[PDB]
Symmetry: C2
Subunit: 256 residues, 2 copies
């Protein structure tokens, strides 16, 4: 192939290259345990948006519906837009519109078998520009998680372990903080789920290092998800169970 991997190019270029590479790696990986392939989403819209491509999988023997998208955007933030984003971004300062760049990969996969879990993954980068085009205010965001129909603790444990290992390669203080905590909190305070990791407005380290952190996080996905799906996709289940799980999670409207 041809993905770039040095350290000299602007973060925006390295990040776009990274997500385009992972989109191909992930679709290929998922296809390795199914019987169908992903295909470009050439749906008729008016303003489809995005800059990259949208890959969709459907009616497979393992994955009923899924999509992996890469989007890149160049634009400007008006004073009003900045004002609406300010509270979630510690360094976003209005100082007349300001140019920005953003890109990210987003995906959602829904297995056919209720014993296998749905997964969501998203890694993105955002930066406003200085007059000279260099990054002014920037941050990374993203993470990944599992939403089970039938819950298997071992699966949640493996998913978390590999993402923890990814984050530990940079700072062991990251995983405990990035671990999704809310649902678990409500579960305890009240008399269940899997979750995963999530971070946003993350600009606390050298961006070149966060780039690598994101790459390592991406790399915790296939080893955990493929392993999990392999051990659940061929488990027995009745049409009734599948139908109830669909009602419980409203899957029909999720992919329509």
């Amino acid at each position: 192939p041809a993905p770039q991997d040095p350290r000299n190019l602007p973060i925006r270029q390295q990040m776009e290259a990274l997500i385009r590479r992972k989109q191909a790696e992930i679709t290929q990986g998922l296809e390795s345990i199914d019987t169908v392939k992903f295909h470009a989403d050439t749906w008729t819209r008016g303003n489809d948006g995005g800059g990259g491509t949208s890959m969709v999988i459907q009616d497979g023997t393992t994955f009923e519906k899924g999509g992996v998208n890469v989007s890149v955007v160049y634009g400007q933030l008006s004073p009003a837009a900045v004002s609406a984003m300010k509270a979630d971004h510690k360094n976003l300062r209005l100082p007349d519109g300001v140019k920005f760049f953003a890109c990210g990969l987003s995906m959602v996969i829904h297995p056919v078998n209720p014993h296998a879990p749905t997964t969501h993954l998203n890694y993105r980068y955002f930066e406003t520009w200085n007059q000279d085009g260099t990054p002014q205010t920037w941050w990374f965001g993203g993470g990944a998680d599992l939403t089970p129909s039938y819950l298997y603790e071992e699966d949640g444990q493996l998913f978390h372990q590999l993402h923890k290992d990814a984050l530990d390669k940079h700072d062991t203080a990251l995983y405990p903080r990035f671990k999704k905590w809310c649902d678990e909190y409500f579960y305890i305070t009240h008399r269940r789920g899997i979750g995963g990791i999530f971070f946003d407005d993350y600009d606390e380290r050298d961006p070149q290092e966060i780039l690598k952190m994101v790459e390592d996080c991406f790399d915790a996905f296939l080893p955990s998800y493929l392993t999990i799906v392999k051990r659940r996709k061929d488990m027995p289940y009745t049409k009734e169970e599948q139908q109830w799980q669909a009602i419980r999670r409203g899957r029909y409207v999720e992919f329509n």
Copy 2:
């Protein structure tokens, strides 16, 4: 129209009637502030499932993508099937499979304007049957929430307020319990995270007479349009650039959510 309402028919029939009525009410309500109409989801996939219909809206001037579905299912839960669900159902017991019925409405709406929020709503009912066909083990589940792109605290407050009002008509102790707004607990660990709106959620709920819970569900349904249409109307015409919309799609993974 033709929906039923008396507390004489079995809960399963009353609930199915309720969700079908609300599916029509909700799609009409949403269409009232858009220029396009919902249409049937006639896709040739592996399994359609459900016993009702899947209404979908797309490329509207107000709503970009959205769906409202009603599904109904009958069948027998094998001993192994029943055993795989007991984990989170206080009264679901082992006792040759047992017949069951379940139904529910689910929906997700994505507005075009990033100043307007995405919403998810789901209300359902499940019951196993006795030999004479009456309910043995049963429960209701549900919830509704908002997922903002651009965040407006006033909108989250209205959404929560109307759902609180609906629950208060039954027991003021319910809302504080069903409420799920993570932001409220950021303080415990000085957590600095992205703001959200949350909503209300409940499951395996069988704590009161089913006829009363059915009414509770109807009241919760009726908190939706008054809050959501009000919110969308005050945000759908706010200025925004194509790029702003694209960024919000990148942080929320919209394109894939559409599928």
